[PDB]
Amino acid sequence: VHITLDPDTANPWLILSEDRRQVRLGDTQQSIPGNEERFDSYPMVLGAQHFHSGKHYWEVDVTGKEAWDLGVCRDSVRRKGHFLLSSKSGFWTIWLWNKQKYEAGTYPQTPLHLQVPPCQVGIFLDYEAGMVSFYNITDHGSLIYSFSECAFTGPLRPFFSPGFNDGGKNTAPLTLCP
Ligand SMILES: CSc1cc(F)ccc1-c1ccc(C(=O)NCC2CCCCC2)c(S(C)(=O)=O)c1
């Protein structure tokens, strides 16, 4: 299935493209509804798709970004207030922080040592195997990180953040690639 972003989930700091394949930080927050699905405290958005089974793959361009978070989450994740992105809270993600620091969302966090900074990241979900894998497309498809034995029981969602607002330092888009 072609991944698309779900506008009803998108925090007001986010701008989505018409085709729902791109998200980026605005310079101000949009004035939009405060509906239950919307992430209210962080620049986060979900894919529209709900996965219950099977293997799934998508590719995200992160070119020129100082920070981002990508992965998968439970449909049931809290949308309102503040929280950590732990597997305990229903998140399997990796991120870039501060231009150079890549990490996997294990507890404690697993530092990722990427000699070649990715411009595109490939994300695989294998529902039945309980695996979420991340590949460095730029570095000829090297494995960044794999979460294993995730033991999923309910629906999952693609998860994205193009960063925190940071005075214009991270306005480059996140784009799903064909
Ligand atoms: C807009 S979320 C975001 C966006 C980015 F562009 C780049 C990174 C993040 C981002 C990653 C991770 C976390 C986070 O939960 N870290 C805590 C550890 C999680 C794994 C288990 C040990 C504790 C946060 S947060 C919500 O604390 O702010 C944010």
Author numbering: 287 to 464
Sentences from the paper on this structure:
Tripartite motif-containing protein 21 (TRIM21) is a member of the TRIM family, characterized by the presence of a RING finger domain, a B-box motif, a coiled-coil region, and a PRY-SPRY domain. Within the TRIM family, it has a unique role due to its specific binding to the Fc region of intracellular antibodies (AB) and thereby marking antibody-coated proteins or non-enveloped virus particles for proteasomal degradation. Central to the function of TRIM21 is the PRY-SPRY domain, which mediates interactions with immunoglobulin Fc regions. The PRY-SPRY domain contains a deep binding pocket, making it the most druggable and therefore most promising domain of the TRIM21 holoenzyme for therapeutic intervention.
Furthermore, we determined a high-resolution crystal structure of the potent ligand AL236 (1) bound to human TRIM21, which guided the design of AL244 (2), a tracer for a NanoBRET assay. Based on the discovered scaffold, we synthesized the representative ligand AL236 (1) and crystallized it under similar conditions as previously reported. Human TRIM21 PRY-SPRY domain at 10 mg mL−1 was co-crystallized with 500 µM AL236 (1) using the sitting-drop vapor diffusion method, with a reservoir solution containing 2.3 M sodium chloride and 0.1 M sodium citrate pH 3.5. Crystals in the space group P62 with a single monomer in the asymmetric unit, were grown with drop ratios of 0.1 μL protein, 0.1 μL reservoir solution at 20 °C. Before flash freezing in liquid nitrogen, the crystals were cryoprotected with 25% ethylene glycol dissolved in reservoir solution. The structure revealed that the ligand is occupying the whole pocket and binds by a combination of polar and nonpolar interactions. Similar to many fragments, it forms π-π interactions with the two tryptophans Trp381 and Trp383, as well as a polar interaction via its amide to the backbone of Leu371. Further structural analysis indicated that a promising strategy for an exit vector is to replace the terminal cyclohexyl group with a piperidine moiety and conjugate the BODIPY dye via a PEG linker to the piperidine nitrogen. This resulted in the tracer AL244 (2), which demonstrated desired properties. Initial measurements in life cells (intact mode) showed that AL236 (1) effectively displaced the tracer, with an EC50 of 197 nM. Under permeabilized conditions (lysed mode), we obtained a similar result (EC50: 297 nM), indicating a high cell permeability of this compound.
